[PDB]
């Protein structure tokens, strides 16, 4: 048993599975990035900037 709060330790020396991990975080933050954008475009009212 490895504790749950350590599961991600399996990468401390796997530059491949680390870059793989890091690649997935970036991918998610972009998803969210454009994701958010769309949500806002789908609800932003431009009719009055005053």
């Amino acid at each position: 048993g490895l504790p749950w709060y350590r599961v991600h330790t399996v990468l401390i020396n796997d530059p491949g599975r680390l870059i793989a991990a890091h690649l997935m975080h970036t991918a998610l933050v972009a998803g969210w990035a454009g994701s958010m954008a769309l949500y806002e475009l789908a609800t932003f009212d431009p009719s009055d900037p005053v």
């Binding site: 431009p46 009719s47 005053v50």
Partner: protein, 120 residues
Amino acid sequence: TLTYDDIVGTGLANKCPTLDDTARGAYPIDSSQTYRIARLCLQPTTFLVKEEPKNKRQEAEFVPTKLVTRETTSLDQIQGELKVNSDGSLTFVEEDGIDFQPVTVQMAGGERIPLLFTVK
């Protein structure tokens, strides 16, 4: 010169009659003779839609809009007598013709404004 198989599809059928830069002439109005208008054409080019008041009474302007239909805008074949009543002024009286076209333009924001472009 240009015929149907000559205009079909070119969309020239919507644009109407031009006068080569030779104009600036003067069509003598007899007054002792009755005049009529054979063909009066009206070709739309730009449509504007006064931005609904903001509520805040601050002079609303007419903004441009995108034509969501196609080249189905021109009024043509319009005719009627060009009456020459006293004091030299002319008065055209529309009698009949393709004097109306349902146009729909997509506005700046998102809306779609359908109007009945006419001169009935």
